[PDB]
Design a protein around this ligand. Structure first.
Ligand code: T40
Ligand code: ZN
Length: 204
């Protein structure tokens, strides 16, 4: 049982999440082919995801990661876009659904930028876009993304395109740069904290 609690737009928590979502928009070298063309989002609602079993898996793993990393779990708030967003908020993140085609190997990817996670809301390369109008830049259909708690532990900073199946010895994640891509190889190293419902906006 998952419970979705609506945050009020007047709430400082809602405002912090939207600020983070809006302010991390950047330009992509694909000219918005995957996510669409926009400079801003229209945030419809923001919901806190509550699930006892998911919180327990996450908290149990944070404890293990801190023991291995001098009592530091090194948690970050990172974005995630997926066409499996409903399965995440009910069953959690699953490394058995790792992104094989990723630059840093078969892991679960998170972005520091909401605009990067938006390219994956309809699948790899933006897929076929919105189910209704098969448009990767649909401004009508409501999209969804997550703003997650990510247990990075001891991160391994990678610069090359070395594909890894697991984190290097002694490490709990991979940070990749040429923006930054965060990779985790265990589903229980991320909690889907907030479910953001939004639209991409057509510039005037
Ligand atoms: C590369 C990258 C960097 C930063 C952020 C992201 C992100 O938020 N999602 C995905 C992402 C999510 C889900 C899927 C879809 N499935 C399809 C079936 N195989 C597993 C992935 C693909 C990519 C990739 C990504
Ligand atoms: Zn549409």
């Amino acid at each position: 049982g998952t419970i979705l609690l609506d945050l009020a737009p007047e709430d400082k928590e809602y405002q912090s999440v939207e600020e983070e979502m809006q302010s991390t928009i950047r330009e992509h070298r694909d000219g918005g082919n995957a996510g669409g063309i926009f400079n801003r989002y229209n945030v419809i609602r923001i919901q806190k995801v509550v699930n006892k079993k998911l919180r327990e898996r996450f908290c149990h793993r944070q404890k293990e990661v801190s023991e291995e990393n001098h009592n530091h779990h090194n948690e970050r708030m990172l974005f995630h876009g997926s066409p499996f967003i409903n399965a995440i908020i009910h069953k959690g993140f699953d490394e058995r659904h790792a992104y094989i085609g990723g630059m840093f190997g078969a892991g679960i990817y998170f972005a520091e930028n909401s605009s990067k996670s938006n390219q994956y809301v309809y699948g790899i390369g933006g897929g076929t876009g919105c189910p209704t109008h098969k448009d990767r830049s649909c401004y009508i259909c409501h999209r969804q993304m997550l703003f997650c708690r990510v247990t990075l532990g001891k991160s391994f900073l990678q610069f090359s395109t070395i594909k890894m199946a697991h984190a290097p010895p002694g490490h709990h994640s991979v940070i990749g740069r040429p923006y930054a891509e965060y990779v985790i190889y265990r589903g229980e190293q991320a909690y889907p904290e907030y479910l953001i419902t939004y639209q991409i906006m057509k510039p005037e």
